[PDB]
C-alpha cells in the first residue's frame, strides 16, 4: 500500500506530527510576544542581517518544510493586510489551541466535535466581543488618549527608550494628514526616509517633504524663510544648437566662441527666471525665491542663482515631484517663455542640513501640505529596519483606532475575561451538546496562553498573576460594578488597563479570534499527509 | 515485468484498496480535509475528492484505472465521484478472502457481480419515491440542495429560477413505442453552452433558445429587423479570390491596372449571385465579408453577418435547419432558414448583439448570463452547471432516494435476504457485496464520531423492521429519518454508483498478469 | 536507528535557548574579546594580521583589525558595527568599546545563572546608564578654554596619541599640534560654524632618517619627481599654477576629431602635427604667465620638451582625491580641456621648491603667509616601515580628537588611566541600595563590569592583579573629617616599569580622558550589549 517516491503517515500519527510541528513554531514565537519579548536576528547567508520582532516579517524570511507552519505563514498573510499588527499573538493562539486539543485527542475524542466545539465557541466569543468592547467618540481631541494608544504599538517593537521619541512623531503623523470628518485616512501620504551615521534618539518629525539632492555652492543661503516654490521643468544643463552642426576651431579661443553661441540659449532662459524674482518681492525682506528644477543644472547657472541667494536643485525623482505639486501648490512650468508669477507657490522657513555625504532640504511649514514625512535615522542597518517596522506597524495601529469607533483594552483584559465568560456561560446555557463541552473548555483554556506568555517573558510566575486576576474579577462581580483588570508586566501584579493606557483595536482582535480558530480547525481536519507529484 | 500466480490478484486488490483508503475521509458534508505535499513548497488543503485524485501519482495500472473511472464519473454527475471509487474498492476488499483464501475462481466472482448488479438496482427502484417534475416550486427546492452553502446563496432565489429555466430549455420530453424512448436527450456539455455578458443584473439573466452572436450589422444603413427571416450558412468568405494554381501578376502599362479592378468587382459579385439564388432575407458567413459584397447583397434585400465561429454554426443548424456548405458555388436552395422567430439586434451591455432565436425547441440554445462583474459570472457559471446536473438527474426519471446512507443500507438488507433463496456457489460473494454496501454509511459514522460497531448494527435492524428511508445525519450524527428531516438524493446518482463501481471491479479481476512492453 | 527531532524548518545549523545559546553567543565574542583586552593602554600589545593581498600589517587599534579579520559570527558584527560608531562619529574609544561591551556580557552570565530574564537585565542597565550619565556631568573637574594655543593643544593631544608606540608621545605631540594650529583659522566670538577638518591634514612617510628629523610644513607635499629640466621655481611670491585634468598632448576637437592611419602621408602629418600644435598650445600657456602646470593625467614626451624651454615646472598628480583638497590651497581650478588657461581658474603659490626628505629628492608645495591655506602636511622619517604605519594611524586618531573639541562639550575633561572607572563604582553601588526592587542585582553587576578597565591595564603592564585592584579601592574610598570629600581623586593605573611603588595622580603626567569620548562610549557599550542580550535565537546557514 505505497507508491514510489512517496511518504505518508496514517492513523492519528499524521495529525500528532502536524500538532507537534506546530508546537515547535510556537516555542520559537513564544519568546518574542509582547513588549517583554525578544528581538530575533535572522541570517540569509548572503550577508544580510535583519532584527525584527514582528511575526510575519520573520516567517517570510524563514524557510520551513513543515506544511503546518506554511499555513500559519499563510494565515498571517491576511493578518498584516487587514490588522497590520499582532501576527505573533495569532500564532500563539493557534499553537496552544492544538496543544490543549492534543490531550483530548489522546483520550479518543473525534476531531469533528473538537472542531465544532471551537466554531461554536467562536460564535459565542463574537457575541461577548461586542459586549466587552468600549465605544470611543469620534472627536479629534482624543490625541491625549491616542498617546497611550501609540505606546501600545511602540513599546512592543523597541526597548521603550525610543517610544517617548516616537510617540509625538507617530501620533502627529496620522492626525496631520487627516482632516476632521468621517471620511478615512491614507497612510501613503506619509513618506519614510532614512540616513545613517547618526543616533536613533535623534529621530524627529518632518511636516513637509524631504528631498534627496541638495544645492551645492558655498554662497547659497542655508536658511531661507518664507520663500516661493517654483516647479521648473526645463533643462538648465549645457545645450546644443537646435540644428545639427559641429565645432570647428583653429585655436582654443575660437572654441569658446562657438560654445558661447549654444550657451546663450541657457543664458536667455536664466535672464527670464531672475526677472520673476525681482518682479515679486525682489528686495522685500522676509521673502525668498527657490528653484526646484527637476532636471539638471550646469555649473554656470549655480553662480548666477547664488548671487541672487536662490536655492537651486537638480536631478529630482519623478515621483517626488508629484508631492511638491500638492504640498507647495506650484504648477509644473515646462517652458521659460511661458513662466508667469501665478505659477509661484508659497512655503515657510526652508533650511538645508549640511553634511558632506548627503544634504537634505526641508519643504516644511506649508499652508496646505496634505503630506508628512517620518525621518528614521540610525547608525547601523538593524536600527533602521527595527524602527521602520515599528513605525509602519504604529501608523497602521493608530489607523484602525480612528477608523473604527470601538476600542478594546489590552494587557490580557479581553483574553482573561472571555475565558472566564465562556467557562460560566457554557454551564448555564447547555445548548450545544454534552460532548461539545470538551471543545468549549479547550478553547477557554487556549485563551489563557497570551496572559501567561506576556508575564513569562518578564520573569514573574504566570501562576501567581492568574490567581490574583481571577480573585480580583470575582471580587468585582460581588461589588456589582464594571471593573476591567489586566496584567501589569513591569510590577508583576494586575492593573487597570484603562488607567495604564494599554488598548487594542477592535478590528485586530476580531480577526485574531476568528482567524486563529478557523486556521487551527483546518489543521485538526487533516487526516493524512500525502506526498505526490514527484 | 510479469506477475503470475494468485499474488497478482492481491496486487490488483491492494491497488484499489490503496486508492480507496485515502479518499475514505472525503465522503459527506463533514468530510475531513486532506493535505497533499508536493515537491514544491506549496500544498493543497482542500477536501475535494476530484481535485485530490488528479494530484496523486500512482504506479500500479489498476490504480490508474480507478482514476480513469473518476474522470468519467465526474462528467456524468457533479458529486458522488469518490463514492463510486470507495464502493468499487471495498467490493474487492470484501471479496479478497473469497478470491484468495477460499481459492475461488475469479470468473465465478465476476459472474456473481453481474447478478448482484441487477439485484442491487431493483432494490433502489423499490426504495425510491415518486416526485413531480412538472412543478416549478418543487424543482426549485430540489436544486436548492446544490445552491446553498455557496457564494450564490444570496442569489439562491434567482439561481433556482435560472437553473430551472435552463434545464427546461435544453430538455425535450418525448416517449412512445413507435420510434423508441430517447430518454429526453439532455446534454449539458454542447447544447447548454453559455455566453458570459459583463454588466447587467443576475435577475436580468435569461435563458434564450437559439444562438447568441456578438457581431452586429456590417452596413450603416440596413434593415435591423426581419419579420420572417431566412438564415443561410456558408463557409467560404465573400471577397476577391485568387487562382488555385501559381498566379503571377505584373502590371506595368497604366491601362492594365483597370483589368484587375474590374475582375475584383466581378469575382465578388459572382459569389453574391449564388447566395441570392434562393432569395434569402439573411446572409451569415463563417469568415469575414468584404465591403464590396456588402453593397451587392444590400440591393438584394438581405442582411449580411460575418465572423461567426464554426462551433456556433453547428448550433445554428439546429435552430434553423440550414445545412453547412463549404463552397458558395455549391449552396443549395434547401438551406432556407425558415422558422426563425426574431432577428432583433438590440444591444445589451454596451455591446451590439444579434438574436437567432425562435419559438421552437431544437434542443440547442445559448444562455444569457449577466451580473455585477466578470468574477460573479465565473462563480455563477460553474455553479449553474452543478445546479443543472442535480436537476438533470431529477428529470431523467421521477424518483428520489434517501441519502445519508439510507439507500446504501436498503440494498444491503434486501441483498442478504434475496441471496439466501438462490442457494448456489455465488451466494458467498453476495454477502461480500452486502457488507460493502454497509461500509458507505459506516464511513459517515466514522466521520461523525459515532461508534461504527453500535450504530451500524442498530441501523440495519431498523431496516428489517421499519422503512428503508432512515439514514444517518451529518450535522447530528445519530440515526434519524431522511424523509421527515429533508435529506434526499436523486436515483440517477445511485444508478451510476452501483453500475460503474461493480463494472469497474469486474475489469480489475479479469487481469491476472501484467504485460510489460511497448 | 536514532531518529531526528526538534528542527522543523530546513537543513541548517540551529541554535535554541534550551542549549544555552545566550552563553554560546557570549563565548563566540569572548574569542575576539581577549584580543582587545591586551590592546587598550600604553602597555598594550600589537597583533599581526596578514592581508588578503599578501602583505603583513601590524597595528594596535582594534577598529582596523576588525575590518581585516573574517568574522562569520553575526553576534560579533554587532560589536564591529558598534566599533565603527567609535571610529566614525568620534576619534577615540575604539579599543574601549570592545572591552566594555564584552564585559557587560560576562557579568550578565551571573544574572542568567540566577534565572533572571534578559529584559530585566536590559532594563537594569538602562536604569544604571542614566545613573552613570548623570554622574559624568559631575565627574568633570577642569575644562579646556579652546584657546587653540600650541601649548594648550599639547594637553589634549598627548593622551590621544598615547596607548600606541609608547615613548614617542612627546615628539609626536609637537608634530600634530603644529599642523592643527595651521589648519585652525583665526577667528573670535563665533561658535556657530565648524572649522577644523580631518582630511585637511595629509601625513606622508619616507624611509630613512629618524623620528627626531621630522618637521611640519604648511601645504600639500608631493613625493613625485619634477620629471623635467626644471627642478624648482624661484622664491618670488604668488606663482601662477594651472591645474589640467586632460593629459598633456596635441590639442583635439570637441566634435569628432578621430585620428586614423591610412597612407604614409598622414603619418608624417601626425608626427609633425604634434610638434607644431603642442609647441603652440604650451606657448599660449606661458604667455599668460603660468609658471607651473599640474596635470592629473599622464604627460606626453613632446610636452616635456617644449616646457623646458619656456621654464615651466611640470607636476603630475595621478590621485584625483588630492586635487580636490589642492584647490583649497593654491586656489586653482581643474580644466577638463587644454590650451585655454583662463586667469580666473588660476591660483597663486608663494614657494615651490624641491627638498631632500629621507635621502630622496621630492618637490615640496608650500607657502608662508599670503593665500591662506586650510591644508597642512606632516612629514615623517624612520628606518622601520611597520612603525611608520602606526604613527600615521596615531596621527589620524589624534587629529580626529580635535574634531571632538567643538561645541558639543569638547573642553570638558575627566581623569583617565583607571581613575574615573573606580570612582564610578562607588557611585553606582551607592545607587544600588538607594533604588529598591529587583534592579539591585543588575546595578551592582553594572559597576563590577567597570573593573575590567583597570584590570587589563595591570595585565598589559605585567603588574599583579592582586596588587593594583585593592590599591585603587583604598585610594578612591577614604574617610575625610568633613562634608566635602578632599585630597586625591586622581589616582589611576600607573604605567610603572620604573620609579617606586603603587599608583599616583595622573595629573603629574598631564594625561586624561576627554568627556566626549567617555560619555559617548558608554552609550555605545550599552546599546551593543543590549542587542546581544535581546537576541535569544538566530538562524544561519553553512558558509
PDB file of N, CA and C in Angstrom, chain A residues 1-4 10 18 65 67-68 70-71 74 110-113 116 433 435 521-534, chain B residues 14 17-18 21-22 25 30 32-39 41-43 45 52 55-59 446-449 474-477:
ATOM      1  N   UNK A   1       0.826  -1.201   0.000  1.00  0.00           N
ATOM      2  CA  UNK A   1       0.000   0.000   0.000  1.00  0.00           C
ATOM      3  C   UNK A   1       0.865   1.256   0.000  1.00  0.00           C
ATOM      4  N   UNK A   2       1.739   1.374  -0.997  1.00  0.00           N
ATOM      5  CA  UNK A   2       2.637   2.514  -1.091  1.00  0.00           C
ATOM      6  C   UNK A   2       2.978   2.765  -2.552  1.00  0.00           C
ATOM      7  N   UNK A   3       3.466   3.971  -2.820  1.00  0.00           N
ATOM      8  CA  UNK A   3       3.880   4.392  -4.147  1.00  0.00           C
ATOM      9  C   UNK A   3       5.333   4.841  -4.111  1.00  0.00           C
ATOM     10  N   UNK A   4       6.062   4.683  -5.216  1.00  0.00           N
ATOM     11  CA  UNK A   4       7.471   5.097  -5.226  1.00  0.00           C
ATOM     12  C   UNK A   4       7.609   6.607  -5.101  1.00  0.00           C
ATOM     13  N   UNK A  10      -0.152   7.520   8.629  1.00  0.00           N
ATOM     14  CA  UNK A  10      -1.511   7.015   8.742  1.00  0.00           C
ATOM     15  C   UNK A  10      -1.989   7.090  10.190  1.00  0.00           C
ATOM     16  N   UNK A  18       1.716  16.928  12.903  1.00  0.00           N
ATOM     17  CA  UNK A  18       1.350  18.282  12.498  1.00  0.00           C
ATOM     18  C   UNK A  18       1.158  19.187  13.709  1.00  0.00           C
ATOM     19  N   UNK A  65       9.984  23.504   6.152  1.00  0.00           N
ATOM     20  CA  UNK A  65       9.458  22.344   5.441  1.00  0.00           C
ATOM     21  C   UNK A  65       8.130  21.865   6.009  1.00  0.00           C
ATOM     22  N   UNK A  67       4.547  21.514   6.674  1.00  0.00           N
ATOM     23  CA  UNK A  67       3.393  22.121   5.995  1.00  0.00           C
ATOM     24  C   UNK A  67       2.415  22.795   6.940  1.00  0.00           C
ATOM     25  N   UNK A  68       2.455  22.474   8.236  1.00  0.00           N
ATOM     26  CA  UNK A  68       1.578  23.145   9.188  1.00  0.00           C
ATOM     27  C   UNK A  68       1.996  24.595   9.393  1.00  0.00           C
ATOM     28  N   UNK A  70       3.554  26.346   7.253  1.00  0.00           N
ATOM     29  CA  UNK A  70       3.322  27.052   5.998  1.00  0.00           C
ATOM     30  C   UNK A  70       1.938  27.687   5.994  1.00  0.00           C
ATOM     31  N   UNK A  71       0.927  26.953   6.463  1.00  0.00           N
ATOM     32  CA  UNK A  71      -0.407  27.528   6.587  1.00  0.00           C
ATOM     33  C   UNK A  71      -0.448  28.618   7.649  1.00  0.00           C
ATOM     34  N   UNK A  74       0.734  31.505   5.912  1.00  0.00           N
ATOM     35  CA  UNK A  74      -0.350  31.967   5.052  1.00  0.00           C
ATOM     36  C   UNK A  74      -1.497  32.550   5.866  1.00  0.00           C
ATOM     37  N   UNK A 110     -13.340  12.384  18.906  1.00  0.00           N
ATOM     38  CA  UNK A 110     -13.282  12.590  17.467  1.00  0.00           C
ATOM     39  C   UNK A 110     -13.019  14.065  17.164  1.00  0.00           C
ATOM     40  N   UNK A 111     -12.174  14.369  16.173  1.00  0.00           N
ATOM     41  CA  UNK A 111     -11.804  15.773  15.931  1.00  0.00           C
ATOM     42  C   UNK A 111     -12.946  16.644  15.438  1.00  0.00           C
ATOM     43  N   UNK A 112     -14.034  16.063  14.925  1.00  0.00           N
ATOM     44  CA  UNK A 112     -15.152  16.884  14.468  1.00  0.00           C
ATOM     45  C   UNK A 112     -15.824  17.597  15.633  1.00  0.00           C
ATOM     46  N   UNK A 113     -16.045  16.885  16.741  1.00  0.00           N
ATOM     47  CA  UNK A 113     -16.587  17.522  17.938  1.00  0.00           C
ATOM     48  C   UNK A 113     -15.614  18.570  18.462  1.00  0.00           C
ATOM     49  N   UNK A 116     -16.019  21.351  15.822  1.00  0.00           N
ATOM     50  CA  UNK A 116     -17.298  22.028  16.014  1.00  0.00           C
ATOM     51  C   UNK A 116     -17.355  22.747  17.355  1.00  0.00           C
ATOM     52  N   UNK A 433     -24.169  20.724  23.261  1.00  0.00           N
ATOM     53  CA  UNK A 433     -24.120  19.271  23.387  1.00  0.00           C
ATOM     54  C   UNK A 433     -23.269  18.946  24.607  1.00  0.00           C
ATOM     55  N   UNK A 435     -20.967  16.461  24.614  1.00  0.00           N
ATOM     56  CA  UNK A 435     -19.618  16.186  24.132  1.00  0.00           C
ATOM     57  C   UNK A 435     -18.909  17.452  23.668  1.00  0.00           C
ATOM     58  N   UNK A 521      -8.600  24.998  13.222  1.00  0.00           N
ATOM     59  CA  UNK A 521      -9.594  23.957  12.981  1.00  0.00           C
ATOM     60  C   UNK A 521      -9.277  23.184  11.707  1.00  0.00           C
ATOM     61  N   UNK A 522      -8.794  23.877  10.674  1.00  0.00           N
ATOM     62  CA  UNK A 522      -8.416  23.200   9.438  1.00  0.00           C
ATOM     63  C   UNK A 522      -7.209  22.294   9.641  1.00  0.00           C
ATOM     64  N   UNK A 523      -6.373  22.591  10.638  1.00  0.00           N
ATOM     65  CA  UNK A 523      -5.225  21.735  10.921  1.00  0.00           C
ATOM     66  C   UNK A 523      -5.662  20.422  11.557  1.00  0.00           C
ATOM     67  N   UNK A 524      -6.658  20.472  12.445  1.00  0.00           N
ATOM     68  CA  UNK A 524      -7.182  19.255  13.052  1.00  0.00           C
ATOM     69  C   UNK A 524      -7.972  18.410  12.063  1.00  0.00           C
ATOM     70  N   UNK A 525      -8.481  19.014  10.988  1.00  0.00           N
ATOM     71  CA  UNK A 525      -9.227  18.270   9.982  1.00  0.00           C
ATOM     72  C   UNK A 525      -8.335  17.429   9.079  1.00  0.00           C
ATOM     73  N   UNK A 526      -7.014  17.531   9.207  1.00  0.00           N
ATOM     74  CA  UNK A 526      -6.115  16.793   8.331  1.00  0.00           C
ATOM     75  C   UNK A 526      -6.028  15.342   8.785  1.00  0.00           C
ATOM     76  N   UNK A 527      -6.459  14.425   7.916  1.00  0.00           N
ATOM     77  CA  UNK A 527      -6.382  13.001   8.219  1.00  0.00           C
ATOM     78  C   UNK A 527      -5.002  12.427   7.917  1.00  0.00           C
ATOM     79  N   UNK A 528      -4.416  12.809   6.784  1.00  0.00           N
ATOM     80  CA  UNK A 528      -3.215  12.159   6.283  1.00  0.00           C
ATOM     81  C   UNK A 528      -2.404  13.154   5.467  1.00  0.00           C
ATOM     82  N   UNK A 529      -1.084  12.985   5.496  1.00  0.00           N
ATOM     83  CA  UNK A 529      -0.163  13.797   4.708  1.00  0.00           C
ATOM     84  C   UNK A 529       0.264  12.988   3.488  1.00  0.00           C
ATOM     85  N   UNK A 530      -0.171  13.422   2.310  1.00  0.00           N
ATOM     86  CA  UNK A 530       0.108  12.724   1.063  1.00  0.00           C
ATOM     87  C   UNK A 530       1.273  13.380   0.337  1.00  0.00           C
ATOM     88  N   UNK A 531       2.172  12.553  -0.191  1.00  0.00           N
ATOM     89  CA  UNK A 531       3.306  13.013  -0.985  1.00  0.00           C
ATOM     90  C   UNK A 531       3.125  12.499  -2.408  1.00  0.00           C
ATOM     91  N   UNK A 532       2.876  13.415  -3.342  1.00  0.00           N
ATOM     92  CA  UNK A 532       2.655  13.046  -4.732  1.00  0.00           C
ATOM     93  C   UNK A 532       3.138  14.174  -5.631  1.00  0.00           C
ATOM     94  N   UNK A 533       3.341  13.841  -6.903  1.00  0.00           N
ATOM     95  CA  UNK A 533       3.807  14.803  -7.878  1.00  0.00           C
ATOM     96  C   UNK A 533       5.299  14.812  -8.118  1.00  0.00           C
ATOM     97  N   UNK A 534       6.037  13.865  -7.547  1.00  0.00           N
ATOM     98  CA  UNK A 534       7.483  13.807  -7.726  1.00  0.00           C
ATOM     99  C   UNK A 534       7.872  12.648  -8.637  1.00  0.00           C
TER     100      UNK A 534
ATOM    101  N   UNK B  14      -4.936  -4.689  -3.669  1.00  0.00           N
ATOM    102  CA  UNK B  14      -4.214  -3.668  -2.917  1.00  0.00           C
ATOM    103  C   UNK B  14      -4.072  -2.376  -3.711  1.00  0.00           C
ATOM    104  N   UNK B  17      -7.387  -0.891  -3.120  1.00  0.00           N
ATOM    105  CA  UNK B  17      -7.515  -0.606  -1.695  1.00  0.00           C
ATOM    106  C   UNK B  17      -6.690   0.609  -1.292  1.00  0.00           C
ATOM    107  N   UNK B  18      -5.525   0.802  -1.914  1.00  0.00           N
ATOM    108  CA  UNK B  18      -4.700   1.963  -1.595  1.00  0.00           C
ATOM    109  C   UNK B  18      -5.382   3.257  -2.022  1.00  0.00           C
ATOM    110  N   UNK B  21      -8.658   3.692   0.413  1.00  0.00           N
ATOM    111  CA  UNK B  21      -8.403   4.042   1.807  1.00  0.00           C
ATOM    112  C   UNK B  21      -8.013   5.504   1.984  1.00  0.00           C
ATOM    113  N   UNK B  22      -7.520   6.155   0.930  1.00  0.00           N
ATOM    114  CA  UNK B  22      -7.092   7.544   1.050  1.00  0.00           C
ATOM    115  C   UNK B  22      -8.293   8.485   1.027  1.00  0.00           C
ATOM    116  N   UNK B  25     -12.066   9.604   3.818  1.00  0.00           N
ATOM    117  CA  UNK B  25     -12.431  10.778   4.599  1.00  0.00           C
ATOM    118  C   UNK B  25     -13.025  11.896   3.752  1.00  0.00           C
ATOM    119  N   UNK B  30     -19.392  16.493   6.347  1.00  0.00           N
ATOM    120  CA  UNK B  30     -18.436  16.593   7.439  1.00  0.00           C
ATOM    121  C   UNK B  30     -17.063  16.055   7.061  1.00  0.00           C
ATOM    122  N   UNK B  32     -13.391  15.264   6.279  1.00  0.00           N
ATOM    123  CA  UNK B  32     -12.206  15.920   6.804  1.00  0.00           C
ATOM    124  C   UNK B  32     -11.300  16.394   5.674  1.00  0.00           C
ATOM    125  N   UNK B  33     -10.535  17.445   5.956  1.00  0.00           N
ATOM    126  CA  UNK B  33      -9.606  17.983   4.977  1.00  0.00           C
ATOM    127  C   UNK B  33      -8.425  17.037   4.779  1.00  0.00           C
ATOM    128  N   UNK B  34      -7.753  17.193   3.642  1.00  0.00           N
ATOM    129  CA  UNK B  34      -6.583  16.390   3.311  1.00  0.00           C
ATOM    130  C   UNK B  34      -5.458  17.309   2.865  1.00  0.00           C
ATOM    131  N   UNK B  35      -4.235  16.976   3.267  1.00  0.00           N
ATOM    132  CA  UNK B  35      -3.059  17.793   2.993  1.00  0.00           C
ATOM    133  C   UNK B  35      -2.133  17.020   2.061  1.00  0.00           C
ATOM    134  N   UNK B  36      -1.971  17.520   0.840  1.00  0.00           N
ATOM    135  CA  UNK B  36      -1.105  16.901  -0.156  1.00  0.00           C
ATOM    136  C   UNK B  36       0.209  17.671  -0.210  1.00  0.00           C
ATOM    137  N   UNK B  37       1.323  16.951  -0.109  1.00  0.00           N
ATOM    138  CA  UNK B  37       2.651  17.554  -0.105  1.00  0.00           C
ATOM    139  C   UNK B  37       3.281  17.369  -1.480  1.00  0.00           C
ATOM    140  N   UNK B  38       3.422  18.465  -2.213  1.00  0.00           N
ATOM    141  CA  UNK B  38       4.094  18.462  -3.499  1.00  0.00           C
ATOM    142  C   UNK B  38       5.601  18.593  -3.301  1.00  0.00           C
ATOM    143  N   UNK B  39       6.401  18.255  -4.318  1.00  0.00           N
ATOM    144  CA  UNK B  39       7.846  18.511  -4.206  1.00  0.00           C
ATOM    145  C   UNK B  39       8.176  19.981  -4.025  1.00  0.00           C
ATOM    146  N   UNK B  41       7.342  23.756  -2.369  1.00  0.00           N
ATOM    147  CA  UNK B  41       6.933  24.151  -1.031  1.00  0.00           C
ATOM    148  C   UNK B  41       5.436  24.312  -0.852  1.00  0.00           C
ATOM    149  N   UNK B  42       4.684  24.394  -1.944  1.00  0.00           N
ATOM    150  CA  UNK B  42       3.247  24.551  -1.853  1.00  0.00           C
ATOM    151  C   UNK B  42       2.550  23.293  -1.366  1.00  0.00           C
ATOM    152  N   UNK B  43       1.253  23.441  -1.105  1.00  0.00           N
ATOM    153  CA  UNK B  43       0.437  22.343  -0.610  1.00  0.00           C
ATOM    154  C   UNK B  43      -1.009  22.577  -1.021  1.00  0.00           C
ATOM    155  N   UNK B  45      -4.767  21.953   0.547  1.00  0.00           N
ATOM    156  CA  UNK B  45      -5.503  21.640   1.765  1.00  0.00           C
ATOM    157  C   UNK B  45      -6.967  21.290   1.508  1.00  0.00           C
ATOM    158  N   UNK B  52      -8.184  15.998  -5.504  1.00  0.00           N
ATOM    159  CA  UNK B  52      -7.081  15.259  -4.898  1.00  0.00           C
ATOM    160  C   UNK B  52      -6.658  14.091  -5.780  1.00  0.00           C
ATOM    161  N   UNK B  55      -4.220  14.959  -8.456  1.00  0.00           N
ATOM    162  CA  UNK B  55      -2.891  15.337  -8.000  1.00  0.00           C
ATOM    163  C   UNK B  55      -2.095  14.166  -7.436  1.00  0.00           C
ATOM    164  N   UNK B  56      -2.676  12.971  -7.386  1.00  0.00           N
ATOM    165  CA  UNK B  56      -1.998  11.798  -6.848  1.00  0.00           C
ATOM    166  C   UNK B  56      -1.343  11.033  -7.989  1.00  0.00           C
ATOM    167  N   UNK B  57      -0.053  10.745  -7.841  1.00  0.00           N
ATOM    168  CA  UNK B  57       0.697   9.959  -8.811  1.00  0.00           C
ATOM    169  C   UNK B  57       0.772   8.521  -8.314  1.00  0.00           C
ATOM    170  N   UNK B  58       0.287   7.586  -9.128  1.00  0.00           N
ATOM    171  CA  UNK B  58       0.249   6.177  -8.764  1.00  0.00           C
ATOM    172  C   UNK B  58       1.060   5.380  -9.777  1.00  0.00           C
ATOM    173  N   UNK B  59       1.479   4.187  -9.353  1.00  0.00           N
ATOM    174  CA  UNK B  59       2.332   3.315 -10.155  1.00  0.00           C
ATOM    175  C   UNK B  59       1.550   2.168 -10.789  1.00  0.00           C
ATOM    176  N   UNK B 446     -17.982   6.924  10.976  1.00  0.00           N
ATOM    177  CA  UNK B 446     -16.623   7.185  11.437  1.00  0.00           C
ATOM    178  C   UNK B 446     -16.270   8.663  11.328  1.00  0.00           C
ATOM    179  N   UNK B 447     -16.791   9.349  10.310  1.00  0.00           N
ATOM    180  CA  UNK B 447     -16.564  10.782  10.173  1.00  0.00           C
ATOM    181  C   UNK B 447     -17.435  11.604  11.114  1.00  0.00           C
ATOM    182  N   UNK B 448     -18.507  11.020  11.647  1.00  0.00           N
ATOM    183  CA  UNK B 448     -19.393  11.709  12.575  1.00  0.00           C
ATOM    184  C   UNK B 448     -19.030  11.465  14.034  1.00  0.00           C
ATOM    185  N   UNK B 449     -17.990  10.677  14.304  1.00  0.00           N
ATOM    186  CA  UNK B 449     -17.563  10.406  15.659  1.00  0.00           C
ATOM    187  C   UNK B 449     -18.329   9.320  16.379  1.00  0.00           C
ATOM    188  N   UNK B 474     -25.611  14.088   8.999  1.00  0.00           N
ATOM    189  CA  UNK B 474     -24.268  14.633   9.003  1.00  0.00           C
ATOM    190  C   UNK B 474     -24.018  15.601  10.141  1.00  0.00           C
ATOM    191  N   UNK B 475     -24.966  16.513  10.371  1.00  0.00           N
ATOM    192  CA  UNK B 475     -24.789  17.515  11.418  1.00  0.00           C
ATOM    193  C   UNK B 475     -24.884  16.892  12.805  1.00  0.00           C
ATOM    194  N   UNK B 476     -25.898  16.059  13.036  1.00  0.00           N
ATOM    195  CA  UNK B 476     -26.090  15.451  14.349  1.00  0.00           C
ATOM    196  C   UNK B 476     -25.140  14.276  14.561  1.00  0.00           C
ATOM    197  N   UNK B 477     -25.284  13.230  13.754  1.00  0.00           N
ATOM    198  CA  UNK B 477     -24.513  12.019  13.923  1.00  0.00           C
ATOM    199  C   UNK B 477     -25.264  10.855  14.528  1.00  0.00           C
TER     200      UNK B 477
END
